[PDB]
Amino acid sequence: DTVTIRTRKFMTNRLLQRKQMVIDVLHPGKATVPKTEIQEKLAKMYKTTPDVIFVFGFRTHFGGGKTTGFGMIYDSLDYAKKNEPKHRLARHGLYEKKKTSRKQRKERKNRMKKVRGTAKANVGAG
Amino acid sequence: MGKCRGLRTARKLRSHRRDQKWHDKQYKKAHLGTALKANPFGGASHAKGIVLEKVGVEAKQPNSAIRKCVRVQLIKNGKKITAFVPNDGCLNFIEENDEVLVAGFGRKGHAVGDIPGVRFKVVKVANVSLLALYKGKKERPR
């Protein structure tokens, strides 16, 4: 297919166990390219697995055909799980967000302040 | 004719101008505040009031007509006003003991045209505009 990828202003980053670059994608006559197709093509460039590759921030220019985004490749998955922000791990199943509302957390705190000693009845089911 | 010109005269020049500004009719009423106490609107562009009475005022010669007007009491001061009602037949919309919005007549507190002693005009009746009533776009809710 015509879909083609290039990499710009690259750097190795030994302080965060990664290498990082700007990514340019050419795709004339098509919609924006999925990030799953971008990361398997980068894996074929750098001769790694696609499992340690993270890409984000893609935006498409007026009149189409070209887009630009940002990406990073980690030395191993245990460095990636320490150094990445938790929302980018959750984009593909490596982290799970807690399911309480902010108001539930606020009002449970303000009920605990009205009791002293072994307060748990206002916490486990209150 | 004789104005002083010496290089140290700035106190004489500055204070004589300050003293002579008080002879300009527009400067004085803006800065004494007597006109701001006297004005039946307290410096606003518009006011609300309640319709007391409907009246016809005789126009000044050399022309002949009966000009349709209303007498109104303002909500925020309780003081009394008379106001003109624009366009043909608009007096039929107004009724009695209800709210009007009133505005200036276009000459900053002076009277306009052949109407003796009228300084204001009606612009809104019971929260509907006279233009929207006159052009048939809206009606009085009852």
């Binding site: 004339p28 006559g29 007026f62 009149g63 | -």
Partner: protein
């Protein structure tokens, strides 16, 4: 409250002081009709950018010859007029800025160039080709008729590559007329 926003903006034209001057009305309409404009505000924009250019050159002409500021800002103003093709390379001094006219700037619009370069049959057809995504400047599809063409950008105006003229797919009218025409035989 404090906020990360900014509030800088300005107006790009001024209204005339005499509303109904007969000598002014027909002069403005002759510029609208010759250059294919939409309204009077679109002429009053071009008079305002010329007035600001002449206001700066009239200041620099007060300073002594070879003053450091007259040398620096004068060379910058002259380069910037040549870059858009409004001023001749063979002239190149502040004294000739005071001789410029509005019709020098109206000629550098992309709408004027699409007509004069022969991509269109009239100044009214040119605006419709630009505003309907048919035209390209270097690599980029452009969509704004008042775009001002630089003197090295001049030789790179063309049709779009994804356009029914310029080598792309046919439009939605020609596709429907062909489809229902074959359907005239039945089962379409």
């Amino acid at each position: 409250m404090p906020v990360a926003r900014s509030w800088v903006c300005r107006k790009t034209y001024v209204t005339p002081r005499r509303p109904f001057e007969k000598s002014r009305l027909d002069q403005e309409l002759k510029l609208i009709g010759e250059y294919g404009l939409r309204n009077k505000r679109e002429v009053w924009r071009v008079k305002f950018t010329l007035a600001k250019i002449r206001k700066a050159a009239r200041e620099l002409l007060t300073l002594d010859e070879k003053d450091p500021r007259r040398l620096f800002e004068g060379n910058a103003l002259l380069r910037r007029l040549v870059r858009i093709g409004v001023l001749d390379e063979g002239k190149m001094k502040l004294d000739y800025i005071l001789g410029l006219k509005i019709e020098d700037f109206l000629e550098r619009r992309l709408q004027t160039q699409v007509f004069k370069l022969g991509l269109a049959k009239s100044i009214h057809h040119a605006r419709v080709l630009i505003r309907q995504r048919h035209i390209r400047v270097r690599k980029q599809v452009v969509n704004i008729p008042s775009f001002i063409v630089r003197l090295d950008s001049q030789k790179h105006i063309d049709f779009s590559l994804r356009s029914p003229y310029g080598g792309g797919r046919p439009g939605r009218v020609k596709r429907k007329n062909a489809k229902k025409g074959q359907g005239g035989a039945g089962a379409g």
